[PDB]
Design an enzyme around this catalytic site. Structure first.
Site, PDB file in Angstrom:
ATOM      1  N   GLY A 216       0.790  -1.212   0.000  1.00 47.29           N
ATOM      2  CA  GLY A 216       0.000   0.000   0.000  1.00 47.29           C
ATOM      3  C   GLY A 216       0.826   1.266   0.000  1.00 47.29           C
ATOM      4  O   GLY A 216       1.844   1.352   0.689  1.00 47.29           O
ATOM      5  N   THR A 217       0.402   2.255  -0.778  1.00 44.89           N
ATOM      6  CA  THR A 217       0.987   3.587  -0.732  1.00 44.89           C
ATOM      7  C   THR A 217       0.231   4.516   0.208  1.00 44.89           C
ATOM      8  O   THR A 217       0.664   5.652   0.411  1.00 44.89           O
ATOM      9  CB  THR A 217       1.035   4.201  -2.135  1.00 44.89           C
ATOM     10  OG1 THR A 217      -0.290   4.266  -2.675  1.00 44.89           O
ATOM     11  CG2 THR A 217       1.914   3.369  -3.058  1.00 44.89           C
ATOM     12  N   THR A 218      -0.882   4.053   0.767  1.00 43.36           N
ATOM     13  CA  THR A 218      -1.666   4.763   1.778  1.00 43.36           C
ATOM     14  C   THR A 218      -2.041   6.166   1.298  1.00 43.36           C
ATOM     15  O   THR A 218      -1.733   7.184   1.914  1.00 43.36           O
ATOM     16  CB  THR A 218      -0.927   4.789   3.111  1.00 43.36           C
ATOM     17  OG1 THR A 218      -0.543   3.453   3.451  1.00 43.36           O
ATOM     18  CG2 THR A 218      -1.846   5.296   4.220  1.00 43.36           C
ATOM     19  N   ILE A 219      -2.732   6.189   0.164  1.00 42.09           N
ATOM     20  CA  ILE A 219      -3.209   7.445  -0.390  1.00 42.09           C
ATOM     21  C   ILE A 219      -4.337   7.999   0.469  1.00 42.09           C
ATOM     22  O   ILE A 219      -4.987   7.288   1.239  1.00 42.09           O
ATOM     23  CB  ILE A 219      -3.653   7.245  -1.848  1.00 42.09           C
ATOM     24  CG1 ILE A 219      -4.816   6.255  -1.928  1.00 42.09           C
ATOM     25  CG2 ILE A 219      -2.495   6.765  -2.692  1.00 42.09           C
ATOM     26  CD1 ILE A 219      -5.466   6.169  -3.278  1.00 42.09           C
TER      27      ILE A 219
ATOM     28  N   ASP B  39       1.805   9.105   0.551  1.00 41.16           N
ATOM     29  CA  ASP B  39       3.048   8.616   1.117  1.00 41.16           C
ATOM     30  C   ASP B  39       3.475   7.284   0.510  1.00 41.16           C
ATOM     31  O   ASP B  39       4.613   6.849   0.690  1.00 41.16           O
ATOM     32  CB  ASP B  39       2.915   8.482   2.630  1.00 41.16           C
ATOM     33  CG  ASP B  39       1.996   7.356   3.043  1.00 41.16           C
ATOM     34  OD1 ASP B  39       0.860   7.310   2.543  1.00 41.16           O
ATOM     35  OD2 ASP B  39       2.409   6.506   3.851  1.00 41.16           O
TER      36      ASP B  39
END
EC number: 3.4.25.1
Lengths: 245, 241, 188, 56, 127, 241, 239, 197, 205, 228
Positions: free
Chosen positions: C16-19, C33
């Site tokens: 995950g890039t945790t948008i 991030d």
């Protein structure tokens, strides 16, 4: 109409004449004059200006819908001369082709490449027996990156070329002579001088003192690369500044 | 003023200023170059008599048959362009066998005629379903069969359009033979007299004389299958005069 | 009768890039991030990309193409709803062939800040805030706890920074999109 | 055709769209880099058609 | 399991010597994931472009593109001889790109070509 | 322009496509439609000609509903006008499906006008012999009135007239200060203008076909209600004498 | 005389702004035989005159069955009538399949209009040379529609098409004020008297040359032919 | 698998019976005035199949100017079912009605279209358990009667009711207003009678 | 794909219309982030629709079905899709899409009132369709189904208040069973007046 | 409209209902119960199966015999051509109904009856096209043509064997044995052997399911007959 080719040396697009001339392409060039409007485009030191007549021969017609200056991309604008529907359809095609270029190549289309694409399509129309040329002329303007202002003129034959100033319409020859005389003297017109040059060419070869509602002006600038169409107040300011001098 | 040339007949898809398509009526004229075929529908059956017109004595007569069999209960009589006729005949045959495969029963005479008509009316409109025909078929057919509704006779012309009949003549002498069928026919006549009248009219309208080699007779009866009369059966029927 | 549904988000993530994206008054603050995770679809319309990088970038390029073309045709600044519509079309048609979840955030004159969220499977729901990617665990509860429904540009920036920072505590590059334009900001 | 020396973004687009077309079945992971009128540009294209514009 | 046996009516006829070796058993699951993606690539690209033109500009735009494509593809060379597609490429935009269809397995040297009349009347829909 | 006028892909020696000009004359073949844009809406009115007393009232309508907010008034070939109504309906529905809101009238006019133009380009199809007007109202856009003609040229109008008597009707519209009138007074004046330019002897026994879209219908295209149409017709008659 | 270049194709506009192949197709409609359609408040009847070359042939099949609630009467080219009837039947089947309800008559007629408009613009085609009188019954009551080769369709209170149909239309215009409250019997009689008006003063309607098709509130579309028309013809006063 | 379906079809000398136990799978839909079909399978396939049969019946009537007989419906259904042979309809069909002689006729099908005419046929999960008892019960002997059970219509109705009662030592035994479709020379007659529970 | 149940959708007939409930919830799996979303559509005056399953397909069918309603609105010829017409169209669409794979994973409860006769229908993604005096699709389908069927057997004829209270009890039992906050549920009702939808009613124990 | 028609795609954009990369596309796939019925060219796991069959050529014909009775074990292709069943019942019945359709079309075109070699070859082609897709056929085509009595075994696996003695099924091993024969057996003696061979199958069974008499057959020159 159904199908076939009309027999005659000037009656089908794919017939040459004994002198090797495609006469239907030349008749398309005469179709450019159908409308009775002249367009002037002038390239300056850091700007390009397109100026066209705005004839609205109807009290009942909403005059904000009559326009021949179009926005192809955000930074390319054109003035179309010729048959009105053909002009609008070629603007639609130029818009699509510019969007495709940005999609494929990742950067926005230049002016020369847009007129080249439109002229390639026009050549295809002149060579095939099912299609016909469009009776219109496209004069494109833009600020490139490192060349500067650009004025380009596609035409019904599929020919295109860059200019320092160009004209299309009824008074194309008179305007071309006027602009040749102007460009021989000096050419580094700032921004005001290019607008005055375009307006003076149009108002001299037509011998008409203009009103802000009889004329359209679209401009690009190096500092403001986006195509902009001047409001009537701005054109009137230019006209009064030209008259006082 | 002036008399000028107007031509509305040199292409299909062109109506004349009269509402009339001339390339289809020229195909009906193409029928009138065929040989005469007479079909009589009676309550005892349907007879089909055709004029053979053998061109050379060296030619196998069994190969120029103008009466063919579509199925055991249907037979066709042909007049006009043979190459087109055999296309429509094969459509009829394959359609009857398709119907038997799908529904396990014999296709009725009218249904066969309707399938052949669906094929035959699909001209013009060439750049829509390539392999289509592009002009009217120059053949008129005479489907004579026996089905759930007893003996039946149908007629199709270069239009892809069929009408049920009780006595038809098609071919080069269809007008005279039809005028003869007009009186010689009555709605309740036996099959023997239908054959009799067919052969008498064929004798009337032929430029040659009745021998058992220059004509061709077939019949379809409610119990019996489609039957093509032989040399000796034909001999007996004509020696009945 | 049980109407069983594909999950569309437990297919393949593992990562995950945790948008994220939050709507404040007259703008949005995407936040995410040495690479960049905020793809600018238009001048005031950005997006955040979840799923496979390849498929998401293909969809984002096609939307950029179509949104620029449509904006030139209709002669108006694009609506954020229009970009979200284009994204939804391709993220729902190619639902089984792409690993692509999208958060579209932007600004347009007639609607203001907008956080249309297109999860995997293709779905527009306008939201006051949207989070995405390995972040439905730590971020969702805290943001549901605190959103204030009416933040300003600065408070929204601080709030999104806090959420993505606690995602770290499980760089922070942000972008605020007002009418005046985009003000990108990199945190660490 | 253009008469201009190319742009690095043009090469990046061509590479990423070609590598996306062949659905990762062309095993080319590249470090593209060049310099145009726009300036120095460095990219990293991956076999499935995903790029990443980076300083290093 | 493909279903679809038109088998209601599996009456179709084929030419045995010309069908070669056909295996409908395996003609339902392509040989590679990329087989159909590459076979129908210009088709799918045209469909994508017509779809975006339709959705942004209107019915007229794909119609005019398809009409130009149909026109140029019709003043061509008979199918047993290779064509250049010069005008079709100018219309589609491939006049300045080289793909892998252009350099691999060159159509101009086919290694196999059928009979002239059979290939012409197959293009005409006659089989 | 004889010799250069059998195809829509032939230019006259002076750059004129004459099939398109003949299509515009085709529009001049039919009875008149006028459309007036006012301060708060658009009003359409058609001098609809009663072909027979046998036709159910409302048949052969020339005032279509193209979308919830758009209304279309046509002239020329009515089959062409119905096909273009279908196209405009498709465009409006497609836009709403893609983008989720009502299509702007300028964009709809562009889409349909560019279709009409696309027919003015090929030898395979002929130009549309029909001209039409679109009219809408939105709170965020105001009243809007567009006219497309067979060549594909669409402009925006304050008052338009298409058909046989477009010139007389245009003379009569110019006397109206429509920029400062509401839809009610415009309906009465539209009826008056339709009654003035009607040629009572050549043509016979017409019936008014009035329609509006405005804020009195909340941006929704409608037929003028029966009572208001009766009042407008009575005003129009009493003004004629 | 100046007309010859502009009337051979349906893709050529005459310098007077007229397509002439469309008008010639309309003539093709006039070359059929008269058929009449009229409706009351509850029924929609179709009456047709059959020609059979006057002897030795079953007459033309002039009234066709499209669905349980739609039936058509044709005048003009038969091939075109069959093509359009196949289209109508397929569209009615599609409606029953997808939506489970009878296709509305007006929607069917609109589809016919588009289908028959395409040949009048395209190359390599000709207009449909058949005109139809469509009788329907749906949620909105009885319907009579007239379709033309020009791809126009009309909602009729009553209508006659075909050869010498002006006399029937004069009768129907004279008597249409009482069609609505007529019951089925005298409505079919009204149609029969109009069809008779399309005949010479000597000839009279018989069972052999009259075909009738009724649809209505309770009825499905039924065609009465050759002996079933006798109840309707028995009560028809002389001319 | 997919229980709840029990179709009992019985062809007499001049009548046919198709009886089903409703449980959600309602069926025994009527095709023509001489034909009844009974579908016992996945519901969606049954709906689509009956819609296809209706469409094909209408197309047949338009092409052939007559309503399509029982044996023709059976043959068409066999080809329709085999049309999806590599992806079959999950339906077990029974067509009951009258033939053109006026006698009774019952046809039973696979999911792929194999059919044969029967004198009676039980179809479904309960069919296996009910079949032997109703079989040696209906025949009363070993004499063939390959197309017609000797009983009368009232006697055959009684047998159907009694056998569904006997099903109470068997599977679900719906007890849900037993659907019964009766094809006689006077037309179809749906006579849903409730099994007392 | 891993499969999760669809959000619950209820509905019971009564005398003078049909009442439908559909609790608001994006999903039970990883899409529970997306809340306050309505699963009820108003097709036209005589038809309404509660959908359980993928929200993407519900949105797509809302598009298509509302555009069909607008298409008939434009013609103004006096015909409108009846509830049975919409139910049959949805059955055809879901069977077609089930076969031509392109899935449509949505289970719908179609309710309606036309011609003084209430309609209640069921369609799922496989093409299964039928009609019942009460329906329950979604999470607590087999828990609410016996309740509804027994209550209707006791009293086959209901009124608005009785039907709505019975639907209340079913949704409550689906709340007491599982702790998901059913603050988010919509009630819809189609009558001779039309389709009237009230928004997110909230349970307060 | 005329332009989209001149184009003849048809492609789902030049139509009606297109609202993205596709949308409703003229009916969201919904269509009709077919556009064409039959009379023209145009998950259920419980298919049915068969048991025991003989067949030998002769001097006077070809003799099929099957394990009694009910069910069907010999397909009656047409008056002049026979065939047995093994494997799927629907497969055998459907593909030999298609074969009889082909045989009748041939007879209509060519005015003479199809030969047994041609008929078995047509069947072998039809079922070889779908090899490996699960067709289960075990037919055994027998007849009489201008070349004399004919006997072929055609299989769903592409096999097409000519022979003068064949046997399929459970008692096949015992029925091919007991097939002590001669090409010049009398007709009565031939019926004898086929009876005895199906019997030497069922000398370990008796009349019942796939049990009864012998469902004997006999392909004469003028078409087959049923001996008993």
């Amino acid at each position: 109409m159904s199908r076939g080719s009309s027999a005659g040396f000037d009656r089908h697009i794919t017939i040459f004449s004994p002198e090797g001339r495609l006469y239907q392409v030349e008749y398309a060039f005469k179709a450019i004059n159908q409308g009775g409007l002249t367009s002037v485009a002038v390239r300056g030191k850091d700007c390009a200006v397109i100026v066209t007549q705005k004839k609205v021969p109807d009290k009942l017609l909403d005059s904000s819908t009559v326009t021949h200056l179009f926005k192809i991309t955000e930074n390319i604008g054109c003035v179309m001369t010729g048959m009105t529907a053909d002009s609008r359809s070629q603007v639609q095609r130029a818009r699509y082709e510019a969007a495709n270029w940005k999609y494929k190549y990742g950067y926005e289309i230049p002016v020369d490449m847009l007129c080249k694409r439109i002229a390639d399509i026009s050549q295809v129309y002149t060579q095939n027996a099912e299609m016909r040329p469009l009776g219109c002329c496209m004069i494109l303007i833009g600020i490139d990156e490192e060349q500067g202002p650009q004025v380009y003129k596609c035409d019904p034959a599929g020919y295109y070329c860059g200019f320092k100033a160009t004209a299309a319409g009824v008074k194309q020859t008179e305007s071309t002579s006027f602009l040749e005389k102007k460009v021989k003297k000096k050419f580094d017109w700032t921004f005001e001088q290019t607008v005055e040059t375009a307006i003076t060419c149009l108002s001299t070869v037509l011998s008409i003192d203009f009103k802000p509602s009889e004329i359209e002006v679209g401009v690009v600038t190096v500092e403001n690369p986006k195509f902009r169409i001047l409001t009537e107040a701005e054109i009137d300011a230019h006209l009064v500044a030209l008259a006082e001098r | 003023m002036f008399l000028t040339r107007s031509e509305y007949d040199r292409g299909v898809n062109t109506f004349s200023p009269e509402g009339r398509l001339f390339q289809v009526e020229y195909a009906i004229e193409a029928i009138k170059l065929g040989s005469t075929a007479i079909g009589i529908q009676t309550s005892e059956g349907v007879c089909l008599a055709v004029e053979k017109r053998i061109t050379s004595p060296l030619m196998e007569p069994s190969s120029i048959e103008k009466i063919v069999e579509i199925d055991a209960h249907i037979g066709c009589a042909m007049s006009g362009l043979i190459a087109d006729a055999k296309t429509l005949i094969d459509k009829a045959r394959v359609e009857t066998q398709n119907h038997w495969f799908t529904y396990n029963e014999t296709m009725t005479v009218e249904s066969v005629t309707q399938a052949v008509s669906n094929l035959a009316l699909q001209f013009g409109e060439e750049d829509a379903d390539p392999g289509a025909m592009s002009r009217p078929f120059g053949v008129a057919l005479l489907f004579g069969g026996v089905d759930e509704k007893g003996p039946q006779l149908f007629h199709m012309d270069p239009s892809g359009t069929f009408v049920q009949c009780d006595a038809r003549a098609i071919g080069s002498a269809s007008e005279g033979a039809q005028s003869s069928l007009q009186e010689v026919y009555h709605k309740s006549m036996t099959l023997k007299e239908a054959i009799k009248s067919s052969l008498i009219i064929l004798k009337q309208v032929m430029e040659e004389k009745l021998n058992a080699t220059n004509i061709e007779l077939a019949t379809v009866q409610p119990g019996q299958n489609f039957h093509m009369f032989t040399k000796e059966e034909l001999e007996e029927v004509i020696k009945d005069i | 009768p049980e109407a069983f549904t594909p999950d569309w988000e437990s297919r393949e993530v593992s990562t995950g890039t945790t948008i994220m994206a939050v709507q404040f008054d007259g703008g949005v603050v995407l936040g995410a991030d040495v690479t960049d995770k905020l793809t600018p679809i238009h001048d005031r319309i950005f997006c955040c990309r979840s799923g496979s990088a390849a498929d998401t970038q293909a969809v984002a390029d096609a939307v950029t193409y179509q949104l620029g073309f449509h904006s030139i045709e209709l002669n108006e600044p694009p609506l954020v709803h229009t970009a979200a519509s284009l994204f939804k079309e391709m993220c729902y048609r190619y639902r089984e062939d792409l690993m692509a979840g999208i958060i579209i955030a932007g600004w347009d004159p007639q609607e203001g800040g907008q956080v249309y969220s297109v999860p995997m499977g293709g779905m527009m729901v306008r939201q006051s805030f949207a989070i995405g990617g390995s972040g439905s665990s730590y971020i969702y509860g805290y943001v549901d706890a605190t959103y204030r429904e009416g933040m300003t540009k600065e408070e929204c920036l601080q709030f999104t920074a806090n959420a993505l920072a606690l995602a770290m505590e499980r760089v922070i590059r942000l972008a605020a999109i007002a009418e005046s334009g985009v003000e990108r900001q990199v945190l660490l | 055709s253009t008469g201009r020396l190319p742009r690095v973004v043009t090469a990046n687009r061509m590479l990423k769209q070609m590598l996306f077309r062949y659905q990762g079945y062309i095993g080319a992971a590249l470090v593209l880099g060049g310099v145009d009128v726009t300036g120095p540009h460095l990219y990293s294209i991956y076999p499935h058609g995903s790029t990443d514009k980076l300083p290093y | 399991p493909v279903t679809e046996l038109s088998a209601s009516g599996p009456f179709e006829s084929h030419d045995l010597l010309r069908k070669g070796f056909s295996c409908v058993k395996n003609e339902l699951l392509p040989s590679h994931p990329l087989e159909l993606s590459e076979k129908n690539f210009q088709l799918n690209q045209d469909k994508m472009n017509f779809s975006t033109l339709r959705n942004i500009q209107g019915l007229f735009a794909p119609l005019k593109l398809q009409m130009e494509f149909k026109a140029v593809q019709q003043v061509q060379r008979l199918p047993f001889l290779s064509s250049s597609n010069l005008s079709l490429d100018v219309l589609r935009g491939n006049d300045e790109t080289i793909g892998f269809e252009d350099i691999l397995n060159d159509p101009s040297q086919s290694e196999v070509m059928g009979e002239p009349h059979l290939m012409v009347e197959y293009k005409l829909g006659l089989l | 322009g004889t010799g250069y006028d059998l195809s829509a892909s032939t230019f006259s020696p002076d750059g004129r496509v004459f099939q398109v000009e003949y299509a515009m004359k085709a529009v001049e073949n039919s009875s008149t439609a006028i459309g007036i844009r006012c301060k708060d809406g658009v009003v359409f009115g058609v001098e609809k000609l009663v072909l027979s007393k046998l036709y159910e009232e409302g048949s052969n309508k020339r005032l279509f509903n193209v979308d919830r907010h758009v209304g279309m008034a046509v002239a020329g070939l009515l089959a062409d006008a119905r096909s273009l109504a279908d196209i405009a309906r498709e465009e409006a529905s497609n836009f709403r499906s893609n983008f989720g809101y009502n299509i702007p009238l300028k964009h709809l006019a562009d889409r349909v006008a560019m279709y009409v133009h696309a027919y003015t380009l090929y030898s395979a199809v002929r130009p549309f012999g029909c001209s039409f007007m679109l009219g809408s109202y939105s709170v965020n856009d105001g009243a809007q009135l567009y006219m497309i003609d067979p060549s594909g040229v669409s402009y925006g109008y304050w008052g338009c007239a298409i058909g046989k008597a477009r010139q007389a009707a245009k003379t009569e519209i110019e006397k109206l200060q429509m920029k400062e009138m509401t839809c009610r007074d415009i309906v009465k004046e539209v009826a008056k203008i339709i009654y003035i330019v009607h040629d009572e002897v050549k043509d016979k026994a017409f019936e008014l076909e009035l329609s509006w879209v405005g804020e009195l219908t909340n941006g929704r295209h409608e037929i003028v209600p029966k009572d208001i149409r009766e009042e407008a017709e009575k005003y129009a008659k009493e003004s004629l004498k | 005389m100046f007309r010859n270049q502009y009337d051979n194709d349906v893709t050529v506009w005459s310098p007077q702004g007229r397509i002439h192949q469309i008008e010639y197709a309309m003539e093709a409609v006039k070359q059929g035989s008269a058929t009449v359609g009229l409706k009351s408040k509850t029924h929609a009847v179709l009456v047709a005159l059959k020609r059979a070359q006057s002897e030795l042939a079953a007459h033309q099949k002039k009234i066709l069955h499209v669905d349980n609630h739609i039936g058509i009467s044709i005048a003009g080219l038969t091939a075109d009538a069959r093509l359009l009837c196949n289209f109508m039947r397929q569209e009615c089947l599609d409606s029953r399949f997808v939506f489970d309800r009878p296709l509305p008559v007006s929607r069917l007629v609109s589809l016919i209009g588009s289908k028959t408009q395409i040949p009048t613009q395209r190359y390599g085609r000709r207009p449909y040379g058949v005109g139809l009188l469509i009788a329907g019954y749906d949620d909105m009551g009885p319907h009579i529609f007239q379709t033309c080769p020009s791809a126009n369709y009309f909602d009729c209170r009553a209508m006659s098409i075909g050869a010498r149909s002006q006399s029937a239309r004069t009768y129907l215009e004279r008597h249409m004020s009482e069609f609505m409250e007529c019951n089925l019997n005298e409505l079919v009689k009204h149609g029969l008297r109009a069809l008779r008006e399309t005949l010479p003063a000597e000839q009279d309607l018989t069972t052999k040359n009259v075909s009738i098709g009724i649809v209505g509130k309770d009825l499905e579309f039924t065609i009465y032919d050759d002996d079933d028309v006798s109840p309707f013809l028995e009560g028809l006063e002389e001319r | 698998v997919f229980n709840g379906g029990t179709i009992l079809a019985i062809a007499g000398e001049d009548f046919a019976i198709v009886a089903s136990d409703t449980r959600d799978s309602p069926k025994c839909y009527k095709l023509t005035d001489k034909t009844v079909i009974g579908c016992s399978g996945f519901h969606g396939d049954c709906l689509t199949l009956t819609k296809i049969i209706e469409a094909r019946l209408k197309m047949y009537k338009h092409s052939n100017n007559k309503a399509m007989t029982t044996g023709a419906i059976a043959a068409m259904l066999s080809t329709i079912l085999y049309s999806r042979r590599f992806f079959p309809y999950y339906v077990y069909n029974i067509i009951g009605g009258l033939d053109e002689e006026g006698k009774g006729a019952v046809y039973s099908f696979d999911p792929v279209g194999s059919y044969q005419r029967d004198s009676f046929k039980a179809g479904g999960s309960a069919s296996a358990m009910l079949q032997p008892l109703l079989d040696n019960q209906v025949g009363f002997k070993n004499m063939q009667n390959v197309e017609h059970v000797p009983l009368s219509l009232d006697r055959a109705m009684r047998l159907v009711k009694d056998v569904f009662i006997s099903a109470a030592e068997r599977d679900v035994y719906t007890g849900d207003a037993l659907r019964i479709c009766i094809v006689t020379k006077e037309g179809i007659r749906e006579e849903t009678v409730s099994l007392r529970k | 794909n891993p499969m999760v149940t669809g959000t619950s959708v209820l509905g019971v007939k009564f005398e003078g219309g049909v009442v439908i409930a559909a609790d608001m919830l994006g999903s039970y799996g990883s899409l529970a982030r997306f809340r306050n979303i309505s699963r009820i559509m108003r097709v036209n005056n005589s038809t309404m629709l509660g959908a359980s399953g993928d929200y993407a397909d519900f949105q797509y069918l809302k598009q298509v079905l509302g555009q069909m309603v607008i298409d008939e609105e434009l013609l103004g010829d006096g015909h409108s899709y009846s509830p049975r017409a919409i139910h049959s169209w949805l059955t055809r669409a879901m069977y077609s899409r089930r076969s031509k794979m392109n899935p449509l994973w949505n289970t719908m409860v179609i309710g309606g009132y036309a011609d003084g006769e209430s309609f209640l229908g069921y369609v799922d993604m496989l093409g299964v369709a039928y009609e019942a005096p009460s329906l329950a699709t979604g999470y607590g389908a087999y828990l609410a189904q016996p309740l509804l069927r027994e209550v209707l057997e006791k009293q086959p004829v209901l009124s608005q208040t009785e039907a709505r209270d019975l639907v209340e009890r079913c949704m409550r039992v689906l709340y007491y069973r599982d702790a998901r906050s059913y603050n988010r549920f919509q009630i819809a009702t189609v009558t001779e007046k039309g389709v009237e939808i009230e928004g997110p009613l909230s349970t307060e124990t | 409209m005329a332009l989209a028609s001149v184009l003849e795609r048809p492609l789902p954009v030049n139509q009606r209902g297109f609202f993205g990369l596709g949308g409703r596309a003229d009916l969201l796939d919904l269509g009709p119960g077919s556009l064409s019925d039959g009379l023209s060219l145009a998950p259920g796991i419980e298919m049915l199966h068969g048991t025991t069959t003989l067949a030998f050529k002769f001097r006077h014909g070809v003799i099929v015999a099957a394990d009694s009775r009910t069910v069907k074990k010999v397909i009656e292709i047409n008056p002049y051509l026979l065939g047995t069943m093994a494997g799927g019942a629907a497969d055998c019945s459907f593909w030999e109904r298609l074969l009889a359709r082909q045989c009748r079309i041939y007879e209509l075109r060519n005015k003479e009856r199809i030969s047994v070699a041609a008929a078995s070859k047509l069947l072998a082609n039809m079922v070889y096209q779908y090899k490996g897709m699960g067709l289960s056929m075990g037919t055994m085509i027998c007849g009489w043509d201008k070349r004399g009595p004919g006997l072929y075994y055609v299989d769903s696996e592409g096999n097409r064997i000519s022979g003068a003695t064949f046997s399929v099924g459970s008692g096949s091993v015992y029925a091919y044995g007991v097939m002590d024969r001669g090409y010049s057996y009398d007709l009565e003696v031939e019926q004898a052997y086929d009876l005895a061979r199906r019997a030497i199958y069922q000398a370990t069974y008796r009349d019942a399911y796939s049990g009864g008499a012998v469902n004997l057959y006999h392909v004469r020159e003028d078409g087959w007959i049923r001996v008993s």
